[PDB]
Amino acid sequence: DLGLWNRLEPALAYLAPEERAKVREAYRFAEEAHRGQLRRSGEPYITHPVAVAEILAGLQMDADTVAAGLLHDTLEDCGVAPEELERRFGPTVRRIVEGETKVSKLYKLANLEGEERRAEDLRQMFIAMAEDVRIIIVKLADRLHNLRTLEHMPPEKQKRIAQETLEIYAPLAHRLGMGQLKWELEDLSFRYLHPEAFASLSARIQATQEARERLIQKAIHLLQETLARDELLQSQLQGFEVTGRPKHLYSIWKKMEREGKTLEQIYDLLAVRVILDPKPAPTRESQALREKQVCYHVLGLVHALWQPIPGRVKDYIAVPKPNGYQSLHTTVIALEGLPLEVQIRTREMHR
Ligand SMILES: Nc1nc2c(ncn2[C@@H]2O[C@H](COP(=O)(O)OP(=O)(O)OP(=O)(O)O)[C@@H](NP(=O)(O)OP(=O)(O)O)[C@H]2O)c(=O)[nH]1
């Protein structure tokens, strides 16, 4: 057995049972449609829309979006008409899979090459044609998985796709507030577009990586304990996760070229992330309050645990960034005299 559903299924627990039922129906429909089809990796095609759905489930997208992630390829390859996807999964799931597949072609057609701000007018083209932003998110999840599996492609295609992601899709994830997605698109694009510079920067970081993650883990273990042993915070919380922030390799090398610095000359600010999953609240309004309330509760315990550097609290929950970015940030003195940046946000805020 393929066993792809058994990997996706756990990621779907945030959906109501009726919604997970729509996603199982979508999985089987995709399973049937792509039967016998193969990816250039030698893996059966279904591996891709399952990976794409899995990315959207990680991002906690609505049921129609994740089901559309499984069906996002069925129309072109498999003798499936859009009428079938609307008849079987409703018009929003069709709308989205039709939109993700249709835009792929528009970018092929569009004449903007070597043009002053060509990516700006091409990014706006998708923005203008796709009023339901879910279409863009599915396209971003698709491009991410394609990049994740870019080794099974000619090196010519590898750089064409990496550059296109760097001009179009990574900036589109920025506009949409999907920074988690944006970072990964950037680093994966950087890997294939400039391989020589990626392999050199990665090697330098892999020398101090033994000590850096050793320190970051002391702070993670300590902050995990502190949060878990706080009875009131846990009373309003379903779950939580404390992680180390990954080095944004593309941005690190980008600032080295611009500021004319070396990887030794640039300051490695250690950062940790607290992701909070609040417990289901009896009303929609009470759920919204809990979301805010739980991040400020954490800010306080972080300040009880580590001494806060003055003027480093940043409240993007009260005042989100222009792309709708919401998180709380505080720079503290942790690790015996070291600056540690703490990012605090909910599961819903983590995009
Ligand atoms: N990255 C990657 N892509 C793979 C793999 N196996 C198959 N592919 C397909 O290659 C495709 C690369 O793009 P393409 O060159 O435009 O597609 P094509 O018409 O040459 O494809 P076929 O040889 O007929 O399959 C890609 N298409 P997709 O619709 O997802 O996205 P696009 O880039 O916006 O057009 C993949 O589905 C694989 O292992 N990795």
Ligand SMILES: [Cl-]
């Ligand atoms: Cl069925």
Ligand SMILES: [Cl-]
């Ligand atoms: Cl834009």
Ligand SMILES: [Cl-]
């Ligand atoms: Cl962002």
Ligand SMILES: [Cl-]
């Ligand atoms: Cl982020």
Ligand SMILES: [Cl-]
């Ligand atoms: Cl410490």
Ligand SMILES: [Mg+2]
């Ligand atoms: Mg091709």
Ligand SMILES: [Mn+2]
């Ligand atoms: Mn696809």
